[PDB]
Amino acid sequence: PSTIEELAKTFLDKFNQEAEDLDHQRSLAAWNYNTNITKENTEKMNEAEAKWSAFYEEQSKLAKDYPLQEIQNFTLKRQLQALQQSGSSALSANKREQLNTILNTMSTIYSTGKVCNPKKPQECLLLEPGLDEIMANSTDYSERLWVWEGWRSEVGKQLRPLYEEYVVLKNEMARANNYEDYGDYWRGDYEAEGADGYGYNRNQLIEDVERTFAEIKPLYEHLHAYVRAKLMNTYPSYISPTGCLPAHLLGDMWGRFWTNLYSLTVPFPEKPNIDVTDAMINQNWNAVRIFKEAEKFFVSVGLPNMTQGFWENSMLTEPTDGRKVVCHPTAWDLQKGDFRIKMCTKVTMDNFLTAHHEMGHIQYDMAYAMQPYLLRNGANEGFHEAVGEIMSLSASTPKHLKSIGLLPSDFREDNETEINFLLKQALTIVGTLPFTYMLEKWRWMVFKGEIPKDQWMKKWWEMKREIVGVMEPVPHDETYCDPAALYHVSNDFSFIRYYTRTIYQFQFQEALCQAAKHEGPLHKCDISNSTEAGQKLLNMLRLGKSKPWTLALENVVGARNMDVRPLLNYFEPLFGWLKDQNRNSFVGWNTD
């Protein structure tokens, strides 16, 4: 006579063990493919994935067989709920197949969708390493424009039909799963069941996003006017001082990041931005040294140093020996206590900075290994790169790298450079906050039925001008599908992470700096050498997904919910400068 909760717990224990084992085995299988791309290794990685995938579905059904309402241990309940989310198999089997075909085709199109300009048609560059390398450093409006509508026309026509069906299937699934619509499904991820004043509801998320964006908007506007102005001197005939910005000119295929506008919008080109790569190069540093310096950083605050297995097994540089591998930074938890990083790093300041967040990931991974497999993750999708970006912030401090011999003692960063850097930070960091919020607002509304198919494009761009203060060269009707041209949209990826993650980092860095009694501007804080912050950073690092991320956060930063104050505060210096620079000009968009 063993209660349903009891019996269920027993289920989990068996799961965790079966799951751990299989996950490790996939993991290794995938690690050999990555570090060693070989036809055989490809085959083996797919096979092993297939067993993991199959296994997961089987176990998910069974999980459902325990009635969620019956469980009383919330800590238990949370692993359970997480497991028993049905996949795309909680509906017709004949529908399911259709859906996967849609998806594979989309990515497929998107994957290899090449565009060709009228002139030199035979050029017909590819999205991957073609257009993108243009949009980034091209100041010809005509060039940039053709590279913009082409992609949006070509794949758009193809993607529009697919997308509509895509929507219908996903709503059928969400509804199947007692969800209002796909939108509300994705808003599940931020749900908290702690129910002791720490609970969280998928409805609260929309309100909270909107509210915070409301508080961000002032900042955004002034960044926007400044950047518009500098652009005018570059693309003088097309921009209008009381209006929005034409999209193609934002450095990327979409204006996700104004990073590439720095050359154009640098406030003081006289003072070069401080690049410590020549320092490293001339000091005959190597990849290993970089990662070792990182390690020290974590140690100095209180974190463990990396496993022996980490140095032994990890790939930290491109294989000299003719092993072709895709090279992107990655931080792996291979689930048996084997932790590793796979960035084929090269010697630059940036890589140095990167390794501090990739290692940051790893330290997270290590921190919650005592938690059970299901609970073995950061409390929501934001935290993991929210914590692996925060180390890249302390690590980049001029204080910090002076400290480790980054430059000459008493470097004395001047305010001209300091502001110059802050702005660069803002192009990428504040640049994308509106972009992102507007996109997930469109998708959320679509999924709730708030937008008809014929009003799709009309409502999308109406939102772009209103919120992002961006406008499109040519009008687009409902033949054009533009939002699908973004990877994450057309590859069925949730997208609001980018926003929440960005508000997370600074609440963190601000609580850690406030704990390391740092004084003065928040952007020069460096937490190194402070165990006080370390221990308190850990205290949340250990929980993993085990407590409602609201409690997770409140431990670190004393607040149960997102607050944008630390963002504003981090950027406050650039703010005041921007108001000055915009003292004599117009701030705002006019929609047309």
Binding site: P1, S2, L7, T10, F11, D13, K14, Q17, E18, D21, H24, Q25, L28, L62, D65, T307, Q308, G309, E312, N313, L334, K336, G337, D338, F339
Partner: protein
């Protein structure tokens, strides 16, 4: 005289823990207690130095291999999965526990799943009890007809040992010496 047990090529998996008894005191603990390799050597109810002076009624050598992490379990008053369902040692235990890293021997590239361990059991081992039954663990009220299904699980699973593993999840051998007074 017991050199053969320690350096044996292969070890019993923990649920079938091996028991070997010795009749001759020709062998000494000089070589053992003075050994760099032994990662653990907790002697309970005795003095590791004092061992060479005495001889005892019954000597008992149980050998088996576990997860690094789990070595802490083999000791009096220890409650865990291994101590509950695999090799409980009685509190009033007088003897000595020995363990050493066994990575190079027991884990192979691509894994060595051959060592196993008992996951469920309807109740805890009695000190030094050995249970090797393979009957399906009927957690539920519904009885399982000798096949694992909803609410009944096979109770034996296999340690996965790879050279890459973490130390805690790395495989070390263990030998426990029991003394009769």
């Amino acid at each position: 005289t017991f050199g053969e047990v320690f350096n044996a090529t292969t070890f019993a998996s923990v649920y079938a823990w091996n028991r070997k008894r010795i009749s001759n005191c020709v062998a000494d603990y000089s070589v053992l207690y003075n050994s760099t390799s032994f990662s653990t050597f907790k002697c309970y109810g005795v003095s590791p130095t004092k061992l060479n002076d005495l001889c005892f009624t019954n000597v008992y050598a149980d050998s088996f291999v576990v997860r690094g992490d789990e070595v802490r379990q083999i000791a009096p008053g220890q409650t865990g999965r291994i101590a509950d369902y695999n090799y409980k040692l009685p509190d009033d235990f007088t003897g000595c526990v020995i363990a050493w890293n066994s990575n190079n021997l027991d884990s192979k590239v691509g894994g060595n799943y051959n060592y196993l361990y008992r996951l469920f059991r309807k109740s805890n081992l009695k000190p030094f009890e050995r249970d090797i039954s393979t009957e399906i663990y009927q957690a539920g009220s519904t009885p399982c007809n000798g096949v694992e299904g909803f609410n009944c699980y096979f109770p034996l699973q296999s340690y996965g040992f790879h050279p890459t593993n973490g130390v805690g999840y790395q495989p070390y051998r263990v030998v426990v010496l029991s003394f009769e007074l």
